């Protein structure tokens, strides 16, 4: 591992220094159907004319970006996404912009969000949750070693591929930072105490979010929930967590070390780093190299009828993509 990562960092650095730009144009694609929306953008299933391939295109209205003050965040998203390369990270194929929008064309992950399957089924058995969790652990190990922080881990940002493996999407809050950062961003249910308390935080927040993820997958509901975000923040800060009767002793022990309000005791943030997590009993049966190589037989494989099939995604109200005749926010997005 120590060896591998060191070589992937070199690749990342070259692309981080000299990012790719304007690698395609809107007219090379046929817009088909909306796969999902969020706070910032809309993601559409598109077909590439010349090749016939299907992709997932994230569309960002430049004006909406400024209004919401996501300028720096959006620039981070594109810059980081085009520089990374990992089995469990969605791949950015092309990126370009026009008078009104910013575009990011990614590989189409047809399996749907883990969210939809999780909600429909109710919850995942421990071995099933472990399978997904192992992939996130490796993903964060790769990301952190590049000085990157994810900041928006949640089932809504995790896609299942044809082989039943995870593909992490949405790098909207990803940031390269050595040291601490202060932005209050993320999703309510997954915020670490230190973020809410506005004290400056580091990569340790991703490890806390993993805790919440594992908990939600195994239980079927998040550890801290309520009707309004403010009520949730109160629960997160208290640190009081209750485990379902069915959780195994190993799982409970792992979660107590991830959902640790104290940074000096939180797994992943100690001397052994990620090793404390990898060597934990709950992962005793996990073959880390096998997962990385995608040699493990996935516990769940989504039904998929031909390319272009969106049956694993909900339906959304379609909206015309408008392109003004005048250039908007030209200077702000120069490097995009």
């Amino acid at each position: 591992v120590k060896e591998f990562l060191a070589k992937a960092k070199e690749d990342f650095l070259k692309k981080w220094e000299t990012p790719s730009q304007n690698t395609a144009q809107l007219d090379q694609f046929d817009r088909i159907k909306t796969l999902g929306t969020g706070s910032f953008g809309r993601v559409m299933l598109v077909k590439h004319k010349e090749s016939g391939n299907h992709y997932a295109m994230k569309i960002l209205d430049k004006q909406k970006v400024v209004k919401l003050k996501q300028i720096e965040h959006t620039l981070n998203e594109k810059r980081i996404l085009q520089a990374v390369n990992f089995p469990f990270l969605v791949k950015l194929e092309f990126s370009f912009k026009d008078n009104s929008n910013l575009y990011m064309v990614m590989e189409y992950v047809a399996g749907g969000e883990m969210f939809s399957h999780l909600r429909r089924i109710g919850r995942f058995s421990e071995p099933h949750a472990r399978f997904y969790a192992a992939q996130i652990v490796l993903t964060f190990e790769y990301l952190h070693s590049l000085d990157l922080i994810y900041r928006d881990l949640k089932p809504e940002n995790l896609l299942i591929d044809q082989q039943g493996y995870i593909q992490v999407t949405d790098f909207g809050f990803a940031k390269r930072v050595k040291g601490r950062t202060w932005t209050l961003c993320g999703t309510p249910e997954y915020l670490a105490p230190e973020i809410i308390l506005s004290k400056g935080y580091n990569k340790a927040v991703d490890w806390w979010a993993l805790g919440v993820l594992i908990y939600e997958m195994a239980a079927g509901y998040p550890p801290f929930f309520a009707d309004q975000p403010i009520q949730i923040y109160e629960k997160i800060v208290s640190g009081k967590v209750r485990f379902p009767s069915h959780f195994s002793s190993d799982l409970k022990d792992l979660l107590r070390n991830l959902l640790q309000v104290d940074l000096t005791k939180r797994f992943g943030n100690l001397k052994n780093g990620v090793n404390d997590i990898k060597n934990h009993k709950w992962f005793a049966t996990t073959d880390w190299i096998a997962i990385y190589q995608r040699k493990v037989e996935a516990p769940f494989i989504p039904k998929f009828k031909g390319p272009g099939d969106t049956s694993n995604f909900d339906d959304y109200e379609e909206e015309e993509i408008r392109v003004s005749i005048n250039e908007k926010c030209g200077k702000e997005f120069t490097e995009f």
Partner: peptide, 20 residues
Amino acid sequence: TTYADFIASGRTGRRNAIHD
């Protein structure tokens, strides 16, 4: 049950990120 309280809550659907 905790599950019943969750299912009756207002945050069982897709959750968007925090934007100010």
